[PDB]
């Protein structure tokens, strides 16, 4: 298992990231720190996510103490969905790189397919609370995307939670300059999402399998959901092979041909999910794991259900 995987932009991303999506404020600058320190090369952000200055301070520190080179990092941000105008998206793109501390970012996603109306509120709602939407459609909002690249700020430019429809729209965009580098959408065991993969990788676009834990800390979470971690089959899986859970529920998506990015704050299971270079889940095994899927979500995007680019009818 090489630890890097060519992306259509011609450069190399590492196949496994930290997640920082509710890493608290408080703790995030140390879960990044503690990351770099044992290895990891690739952290996975958001403006969304309120903590990008923290994980700034993170990454410009490790960096200032020579650990790392900015070569050797693989950084990657989201444009949220206020920000679909195509005189908004350099403002965006720039506010997450100040944050970031950074002059450049490896990869910027166009975080959801819906863009709504600009203003403060990341989801602007009508009074009887629907989300408000943008009328700029994705293939505009591409074009500013594209942009970015021509203007050095991003060295890669993809999609997430985009649909195979969604996917084939910009695939098929009059004049396409660049194509998308990467989607990265939810995946793992309950929600395999064998089609979409293997559209995606048909056309040379890298999947990143994110929540691949099953986010047991979503704040929607329900005691009947179904539990990943708990699931005794997938135990059964890691105690045959001396790993933890998430060491089998990460090194997964890795023999998938998948990017993943499990988020921690805690420092030991930050170690503990980068052991998974190491050992090797058999066809059986892959089969067994994929055979539990249920179409299960962590991420409906419940607020935008109305959006008529809602990915996920
Ligand atoms: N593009 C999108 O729309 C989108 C949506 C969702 C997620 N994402 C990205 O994907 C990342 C990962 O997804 P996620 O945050 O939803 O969830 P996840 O990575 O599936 O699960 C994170 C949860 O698992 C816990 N955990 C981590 N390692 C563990 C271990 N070894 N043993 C036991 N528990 C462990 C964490 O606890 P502690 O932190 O307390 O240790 C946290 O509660 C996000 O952080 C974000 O970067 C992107």
């Known amino acids: 298992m090489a630890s890097r ?8 991303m590492p196949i496994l990231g930290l997640g920082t999506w509710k890493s608290p404020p408080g703790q995030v600058t140390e879960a990044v720190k503690v990351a770099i320190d044992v290895g990891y090369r690739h952290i996975d952000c958001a403006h969304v996510y309120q903590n990008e200055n923290e994980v700034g301070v993170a990454i410009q520190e490790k960096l200032r103490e020579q650990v790392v080179k900015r070569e050797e990092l693989f950084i990657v941000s989201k444009l949220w969905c206020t920000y679909h105008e195509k005189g908004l998206v350099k403002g965006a793109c720039q ?7 950074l002059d450049y970012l490896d990869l910027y996603l166009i975080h959801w397919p819906t863009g709504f109306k600009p203003g403060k509120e990341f989801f602007p709602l009508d009074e009887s609370g629907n989300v408000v939407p943008s009328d700029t459609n994705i293939l505009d909002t591409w074009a500013a995307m594209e942009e970015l690249v021509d203007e050095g700020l991003v060295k890669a430019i993809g999609i997430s939670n985009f649909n195979h429809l969604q996917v084939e729209m910009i695939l098929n965009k009059p004049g396409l300059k660049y194509k998308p580098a990467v989607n990265q959408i939810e995946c793992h065991p309950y929600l395999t999402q064998e089609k979409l993969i293997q559209y995606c990788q048909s056309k040379g676009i890298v999947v990143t399998a994110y929540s691949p834990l099953g986010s047991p800390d979503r704040p929607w979470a329900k005691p009947e959901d179904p539990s990943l971690l708990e699931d005794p ?6 105690a045959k092979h001396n790993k933890t859970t998430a060491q089998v529920l990460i090194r997964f998506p890795m023999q998938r041909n998948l990017v993943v990015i499990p988020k921690s704050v805690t420092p030991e299971r930050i170690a503990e999910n980068f052991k998974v270079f190491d050992f090797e889940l058999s066809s059986q095994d892959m089969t067994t794991l994929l055979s539990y899927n249920r179409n299960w979500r962590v991420c409906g995007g419940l607020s935008c259900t109305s959006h008529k680019d809602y990915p996920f009818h």
Request: cysteine-free; aromatic content about 0%.
């Open 233 to 238: 089959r997938i135990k059964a899986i890691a």
């Open 5 to 12: 995987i060519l992306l259509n932009n011609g450069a190399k």
């Open 95 to 101: 506010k997450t790189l100040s944050d970031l501390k």
